[PDB]
Design a protein around this ligand. Structure first.
Ligand SMILES: Nc1nc2c(ncn2[C@@H]2O[C@H](COP(=O)(O)OP(=O)(O)O)[C@@H](O)[C@H]2O)c(=O)[nH]1
Ligand SMILES: [Ca+2]
Ligand SMILES: [Mg+2]
Ligand SMILES: [Zn+2]
Length: 419
């Protein structure tokens, strides 16, 4: 309603009437941390790269707020590709089109966003610092594309006795216009809970009166009450410099043998991925499933009627329909997606508490264990709020759909606990 406008404005950016990676008919899929638009076909490869590189939401199918659309309105395809496809020629270009071979698409998108082949080239410490205060997002992107690593600090101007890291600075010298860079930095190389006199990026926001910066920092879910050399928390500095507005948000910062399986979870969790590796034995490439999938897995003399339903924000209220006559629940959780865990917490708890769902076996796949910072199964139990789940039969199973690891074991548990 308030966002309808912003969506419409995102689409009308230069180059956004074509897919970022294959230039297809007006794309609906946003890589929220890059502010770019891809078709449903290119979209799936981003989901393959992980939330570490790309965070896909549909403008059409996911539920989006003003806050998530910041870079989208301030980036768009043309601006982005100007940097990232700078060394791409016109003729014989490796960049694909509308309906190209998945192999060719995949090979290109992986080289572009992860390896950064086609992006403009150079080194470089100070130029970044200059771009930040200049608020030149496009140059910051250039830096990011050449492999800058925002985690490590840069020397500053005259009498440079101390040393500050990228994000810390961007916050200090920020206003309304300075925002998207703050957001880009957080979502792309931002070691959010970094310290360096041991002041957090959170602390700084309270020192220089940066209300909108505080908003973005907690959106990325940040540490509160961490102490520095003075023994000051985020709340504490806001009082010493008496910056009124910030303190309001910091106070809120606290509070024979067959079986029908329903397989749910948030978008991009790996639901389809799991289902088809189990059914085919080989791993397959996956487009986001706009409807749902049904296949029958016959592992160890037991028929599994698996119902893989897509989990875009808009297509979740349809889950209710698949509850009736279900025995086992497979909730797939993307573990690399540390940001959307309380979302999965909520959506699982919304299911297992449905009055049409008590007599359900619950198997949680703690999927994507192969990815870098993965977040372990024990850590999943606690965060998914299974500590106080009693008189319910749950079981978290470490898995990696791409390789196949952990998957059959989950079934084994279903067989066994279908007593
Ligand atoms: N690294 C890794 N990637 C995975 C794993 N499972 C799924 N993926 C990727 O995540 C993306 C989303 O999978 P998908 O089944 O379409 O998610 P769905 O929307 O819940 O059905 C796919 O591109 C997969 O390549 C995993 O265990 N490890
Ligand atoms: Ca969402
Ligand atoms: Mg799916
Ligand atoms: Zn495309």
């Amino acid at each position: 309603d308030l966002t309808k406008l912003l969506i419409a404005e995102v689409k009308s950016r230069p180059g956004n009437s074509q897919c970022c990676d294959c230039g297809a008919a007006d794309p609906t899929w946003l890589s929220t941390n890059l502010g770019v638009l891809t078709c449903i076909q290119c979209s799936g490869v981003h989901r393959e790269l992980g939330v570490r590189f790309s965070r896909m939401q549909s403008l059409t199918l996911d539920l989006l707020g003003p806050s998530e659309l910041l870079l989208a309105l301030n980036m768009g395809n043309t601006s982005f590709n100007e940097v990232m496809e700078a060394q791409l020629p016109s003729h014989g270009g490796p960049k694909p089109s509308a309906e190209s071979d998945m192999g060719t698409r995949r090979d290109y998108i992986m080289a572009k966003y992860v390896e950064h082949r086609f992006a403009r080239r150079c080194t470089e410490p100070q130029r970044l610092w200059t771009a930040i205060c200049n608020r030149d997002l496009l140059s910051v992107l250039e830096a990011f594309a050449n492999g800058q690593d925002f985690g490590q600090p840069l020397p500053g101007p005259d009498a440079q006795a101390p040393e500050e890291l990228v994000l810390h600075l961007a916050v200090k010298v920020a206003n309304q216009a300075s925002l998207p860079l703050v957001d880009f930095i957080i979502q792309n190389g931002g070691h959010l809970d970094a310290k360096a006199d041991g002041n957090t990026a959170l602390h700084y926001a309270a020192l220089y009166n940066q209300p909108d910066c505080l908003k973005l920092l907690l959106k990325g879910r940040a540490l509160v009450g961490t102490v520095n050399e003075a023994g000051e928390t985020a709340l504490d500095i806001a009082r010493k410099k008496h910056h009124k507005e910030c303190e309001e948000l910091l106070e809120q910062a606290q509070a024979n043998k067959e079986m029908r399986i329903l397989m749910l979870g948030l978008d991009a969790a790996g639901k389809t991925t799991i289902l088809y590796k189990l059914k085919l034995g080989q791993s397959v490439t996956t487009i986001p499933t706009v409807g749902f999938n049904v296949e029958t897995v016959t592992y160890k003399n037991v028929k599994f009627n698996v119902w893989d339903v897509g989990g875009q924000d808009k297509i979740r209220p349809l889950w209710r329909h698949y509850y009736t006559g279900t025995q086992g629940l497979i909730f797939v959780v993307d573990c690399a997606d540390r940001d959307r865990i309380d979302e999965a917490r909520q959506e699982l708890h919304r299911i297992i508490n449905d009055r049409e769902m008590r007599d359900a076996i619950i198997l949680i796949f703690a999927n994507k264990q192969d990815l870098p910072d993965a977040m372990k199964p024990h850590e999943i139990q606690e965060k998914l709020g299974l500590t106080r789940i009693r008189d319910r039969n749950w079981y978290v199973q470490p898995s990696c759909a791409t390789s196949g690891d952990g998957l059959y074991e989950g079934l084994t548990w279903l067989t066994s606990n279908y007593k």
